[PDB]
Each structure stands twice: as C-alpha cells, then as structure tokens.
Design an enzyme around this catalytic site. Structure first.
Site, PDB file in Angstrom:
ATOM      1  N   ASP A 158      64.420 102.253  83.377  1.00 52.44           N
ATOM      2  CA  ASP A 158      64.501 100.895  83.984  1.00 52.44           C
ATOM      3  C   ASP A 158      65.554 100.083  83.261  1.00 52.44           C
ATOM      4  O   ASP A 158      66.428  99.477  83.884  1.00 52.44           O
ATOM      5  CB  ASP A 158      63.163 100.127  83.910  1.00 52.44           C
ATOM      6  CG  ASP A 158      62.024 100.797  84.668  1.00 52.44           C
ATOM      7  OD1 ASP A 158      62.275 101.475  85.690  1.00 52.44           O
ATOM      8  OD2 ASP A 158      60.854 100.610  84.215  1.00 52.44           O
TER       9      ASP A 158
ATOM     10  N   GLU B  86      55.750  98.552  88.286  1.00 53.78           N
ATOM     11  CA  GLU B  86      55.268  97.773  87.141  1.00 53.78           C
ATOM     12  C   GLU B  86      54.789  96.392  87.562  1.00 53.78           C
ATOM     13  O   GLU B  86      53.707  95.954  87.144  1.00 53.78           O
ATOM     14  CB  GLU B  86      56.352  97.665  86.073  1.00 53.78           C
ATOM     15  CG  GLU B  86      56.883  99.006  85.686  1.00 53.78           C
ATOM     16  CD  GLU B  86      58.149  98.924  84.823  1.00 53.78           C
ATOM     17  OE1 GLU B  86      58.175  99.641  83.819  1.00 53.78           O
ATOM     18  OE2 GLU B  86      59.069  98.137  85.114  1.00 53.78           O
TER      19      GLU B  86
HETATM   20  N1  LIG Z   1      62.371  99.834  71.555  1.00 56.72           N
HETATM   21  C1  LIG Z   1      62.855  98.917  72.424  1.00 56.72           C
HETATM   22  N2  LIG Z   1      64.028  98.280  72.255  1.00 56.72           N
HETATM   23  C2  LIG Z   1      64.547  97.384  73.120  1.00 56.72           C
HETATM   24  N3  LIG Z   1      63.917  97.008  74.268  1.00 56.72           N
HETATM   25  C3  LIG Z   1      62.715  97.584  74.551  1.00 56.72           C
HETATM   26  C4  LIG Z   1      62.113  98.585  73.655  1.00 56.72           C
HETATM   27  N4  LIG Z   1      60.921  98.952  74.185  1.00 56.72           N
HETATM   28  C5  LIG Z   1      60.792  98.266  75.351  1.00 56.72           C
HETATM   29  N5  LIG Z   1      61.857  97.447  75.561  1.00 56.72           N
HETATM   30  C6  LIG Z   1      62.091  96.553  76.719  1.00 56.72           C
HETATM   31  O1  LIG Z   1      60.839  96.415  77.399  1.00 56.72           O
HETATM   32  C7  LIG Z   1      60.972  96.847  78.759  1.00 56.72           C
HETATM   33  C8  LIG Z   1      59.661  97.392  79.298  1.00 56.72           C
HETATM   34  O2  LIG Z   1      59.470  98.716  78.759  1.00 56.72           O
HETATM   35  P1  LIG Z   1      58.316  99.670  79.397  1.00 56.72           P
HETATM   36  O3  LIG Z   1      57.071  99.023  78.768  1.00 56.72           O
HETATM   37  O4  LIG Z   1      58.592 101.032  78.865  1.00 56.72           O
HETATM   38  O5  LIG Z   1      58.380  99.448  80.897  1.00 56.72           O
HETATM   39  C9  LIG Z   1      62.083  97.887  78.695  1.00 56.72           C
HETATM   40  O6  LIG Z   1      62.654  98.026  79.988  1.00 56.72           O
HETATM   41  C10 LIG Z   1      63.043  97.251  77.694  1.00 56.72           C
HETATM   42  O7  LIG Z   1      63.907  96.287  78.333  1.00 56.72           O
HETATM   43 MG   LIG Z   2      59.843 100.039  82.443  1.00 52.20          MG
HETATM   44 NA    NA Z   3      57.041 102.137  81.067  1.00 57.03          NA
END
Ligand SMILES: Nc1ncnc2c1ncn2[C@@H]1O[C@H](COP(=O)(O)O)[C@@H](O)[C@H]1O
Ligand SMILES: [Mg+2]
Ligand code: NA
Ligand SMILES: Nc1ncnc2c1ncn2[C@@H]1O[C@H](COP(=O)(O)O)[C@@H](O)[C@H]1O
Ligand SMILES: [Mg+2]
Ligand SMILES: [Mg+2]
Ligand SMILES: [Mg+2]
Ligand code: NA
Lengths: 238, 238
Positions: free
Chosen positions: B36, B136
């Site tokens: 994403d 999401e």
């Molecule tokens: N380790 C990380 N570093 C930078 N941004 C992050 C990280 N983990 C999550 N994000 C941000 O949080 C959003 C949601 O992540 P997710 O929970 O995997 O859908 C991601 O699309 C990133 O923009």
């Molecule tokens: Mg995501």
């Molecule tokens: Na995710």
C-alpha cells in the site's frame, strides 16, 4: 437561547446516551487547568459514568495549572493520573535530528497527549472527550490529530462566554474561571495574544455582530488556513 | 471500470492538483516495505512534486521490510530518512505504567509514526499521504489517529487486488508484490490471519459478489466494531 442549567442537563444526557450507544464504559479527558477541559470533565462526571482525568504537563507548563486541575479532581472525586510528557517528547525530538520551531513543538506535544488519552481509553474501554469550543473550532486553534483528535465534542457549539457561564454554574474553581485562556506553550502565553483577536470578538462574530476590521482580518485568516483541520482527509471522486 | 494505466494517471493528476491547491509543496509518506505504501509513494513520485519517505522501524519490525522500503526509495531516487521509533516508544510506554496489550502497543507505534510524518510535513510544507485501501477502510484495520490519520488518501477507493495491479504496473520490487500483507507487529504476522478472512473475500464483498458465511462473519465483525473510526467526532445537534 442558552441558559447554563438547562444546557448543562441536555449535555449531560447527550454524553450519557452517546457513551452508552457508542458503546463504551465511560470517559477520559485531559485536564490542563483551563476552562474548556474543566467544564467538559465536570459535565462527564455528572453522567454518573466512570470518568478519568489525565494531567500531562510538559516543562513549559505552569505549576498553578497543575494545581488547579488537581483541585477540580479533588472536588469531582475522580480517578486521575499525572504524567510528564517531557521525557517522551525529548526522545521524539532527538530522533528527528536527521531532518531538522515552536509551533512544531506545540503540535508534537498535543499529539503526545492524544497518545496518552487513547492509550488509557483503549485499556479501560473509555471514549476520549475533546474540549474544542465553537471559537477554537472556527479559528482552527487546535492541533490536527492532537487536541483536535477525540471521540466526542460536547462544547463545540458553545461560545467561549457560554463555556465560562457553564463553569460558573458547575462550580469550577475560581482560578480556572479567572485565568487567561492559554495553550500553555510558555509562561504568559494567551490565546488572545496569539490569535490577535479576543474571545468576545470571536463570539460576536459567531453571533453575526459587528467586529473591528483587525478582528475580522484575524478571524478570516485563522479560519481560512484551517479548512482541512475540520474535515476528513481528501479522497478521490473516482 | 479499473485499468492500471488509466487509473494511475488519474490518481497522479489528482494528487498533483490536490497538493497544489492545498496549498503545499509536496508529499511525505511512511514506507513500511508493504504494497500500500509502496504504491502510494510511487504515485506521489510520478507527480514530479517533492516527495520524501520516512522509514520508521520499531524493534518488532522485520529487517527485510526496512530493506524492501529502502530498495524502493533507491529506485525512486527520493529524499528519505530511516529513524528507529524505539527510543520514543520506550519512553512513552514506560511512562504509562501507572494506569497500564499488543493492540495497545501497535496503536501507540502507529501514532508515533503519525507524529514523525506531521513533524516532517510541517517543517517542509508537505502533505501526509495516508495509504488506507478500501479493504482496510471497510474493516477498520487501521489505528485511529495513527495510520488512519492523513491529509490525503489516494488508495481508499481501491480493492487490495487493484492495489497489487498498480504495484505491478508501477514496477514495485518483486518481494513487495509477493509478500504477505502485514501490520509488522511480529515475525510471521499476516493481515489475513489476523482478520480471519482473505483479501479476495473482502474484495468480492465490496464488489457485491458472493462470499462464505465464515468470511462474511469476520467481515461484519470487524466493520461493526469500527463505525466511529471512519467518521468525525460526535457532536451535539443542539
Ligand atoms: N515500519 C514502518 N515505517 C514507516 N511507515 C510505516 C511502518 N509500518 C507501517 N507504516 C505506515 O503505516 C501504514 C499502515 O501499515 P499496515 O498496518 O501494514 O496497513 C503503512 O502503509 C505505512 O505508511
Ligand atoms: Mg496497508
Ligand atoms: Na496491513
Ligand atoms: N498539561 C495538560 N494536561 C492535560 N491535558 C492538556 C494539557 N494541555 C492541554 N491539554 C488538553 O488539550 C486541550 C486543548 O488545550 P488548549 O490548547 O488550551 O485549548 C485541553 O482542553 C486539554 O484537554
Ligand atoms: Mg481550550
Ligand atoms: Mg488551555
Ligand atoms: Mg504493512
Ligand atoms: Na486555549
């Protein structure tokens, strides 16, 4: 029309029903020592639902503001926690060095407070009360995802003068009624000095009453630059 | 009627116009090493406006995910910073002792990332791109005022399969295309295991296609417990 006694009962009932329908157990609120949070906390307690106050000082905050909040907490007889945000803030700030402002600081600190409140809220199945009044909302005098981030906003239709009237009705400590509205970013800072317009002028503007050219310029300036703070994020029409 | 090429160009035009009109100079985005944020970053870069990526690992994150994000940044030739959120997170967590679990940890880290993004954005006049896709969003699989908090949401009308189609079209590195969608909270964590329902099932539901009773039970369970995550704070109608 507005009278404190009646409007207070309507808000208490609306908080209670809103919380039950949410659904949640009760409320959490940040208590700054200011009038908006004092009023919102007092209203939440009157629902008879579990209400917790957090006091979240940074090093730029005044002792009296902590003491005023604690005094309200004593009178209200509620659960409370006092935690300095300063160590977390200092670690956050240090970690930003590779890409580095007073406003930037103020906003980080507001967002740290949001983190504390939502941490508590999730642990105890509470909803977070935001304290924005009609003046702060219109002026965008709040941090996006900081104090602007909440589940429920009981004061958002109230003029500042109406917030004060509720304070008097609710027997909020005298010093909270008499002190200058302030974000607490430094000693002697006042909302009215920062905005360059008084709350009475903003309230009169909200009422469709005449204000001076300078007041109006400042009102329009603050309102114009804060449109995105009030709305959901931008999304495609496709 | 989705086509990667055509939709991509529409999104790029919209991002550009939205940013110009905000007004802002460009973008900032958190890169997790997932699809994403990879797609969202790639689109931002195509506008030709200044675009910066933050990599924000905690000790829970997998080193491969940082490496994949870095790989994308190298390909895109963008300004970026890699900053451990662990010091700030530990100071925050320690300080919550008096009132204080993995979900709470996950939520605090997401809100720290929000803080980083907004600290950068305000310092460099950027807007924060949120990466929420239609799945999401519908499932409320995001942290309120964490990754759910952004200025602009280019992917929020897209099914997960359409996000992947954009990834393929935008030449996102193969490991990002192929890896399991994951919030990165522990090794082997996957979104589909967490939700109990596959992205294909969620996507079919959003499209008005038949899904299993098991799938549909997980979809409504998640969607139902997150009504308030999508909307603005509750306000009185009086
Ligand atoms: N380790 C990380 N570093 C930078 N941004 C992050 C990280 N983990 C999550 N994000 C941000 O949080 C959003 C949601 O992540 P997710 O929970 O995997 O859908 C991601 O699309 C990133 O923009
Ligand atoms: Mg995501
Ligand atoms: Na995710
Ligand atoms: N030191 C503090 N402790 C607890 N809550 C605070 C503190 N400073 C600000 N807040 C919260 O932030 C809100 C906004 O403050 P203000 O910027 O003065 O309108 C207050 O109503 C409180 O709910
Ligand atoms: Mg206030
Ligand atoms: Mg104040
Ligand atoms: Mg991910
Ligand atoms: Na204030």
């Amino acid at each position: 029309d507005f009278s404190p006694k009646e409007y207070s009962q309507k808000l208490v009932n609306w908080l209670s029903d809103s919380c039950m329908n949410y659904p949640a157990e009760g409320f959490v609120i940040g208590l700054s020592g200011g009038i908006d949070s004092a009023v919102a906390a007092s209203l939440a307690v009157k629902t008879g639902l579990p209400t917790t106050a957090l006091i979240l000082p940074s090093d730029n905050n005044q002792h009296q503001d902590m003491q005023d909040a604690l005094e309200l907490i004593e009178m209200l007889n509620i659960e409370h926690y006092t935690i300095s945000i300063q160590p977390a803030y200092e670690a956050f700030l240090a970690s930003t060095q590779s890409f580095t402002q007073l406003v930037i600081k103020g906003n980080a600190q507001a967002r740290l407070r949001m983190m504390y409140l939502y941490a508590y809220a999730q642990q105890y199945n509470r909803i977070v009360i935001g304290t924005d009044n009609a003046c702060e909302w219109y002026m965008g005098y709040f941090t996006k995802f900081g104090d602007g981030a909440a589940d429920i906003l009981p004061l958002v239709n109230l003029k500042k003068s109406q917030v004060f009237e509720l304070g008097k009705y609710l027997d909020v400590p005298k010093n909270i009624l008499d002190k200058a509205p302030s974000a607490g970013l430094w000693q002697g800072q006042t909302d009215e000095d920062e905005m360059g317009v008084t709350y009475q002028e903003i309230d009169d503007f909200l009422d469709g009453k005449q204000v001076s050219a300078k007041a109006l310029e400042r009102i329009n300036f603050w309102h114009n630059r804060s449109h995105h703070k009030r709305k959901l994020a931008l999304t495609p029409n496709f």
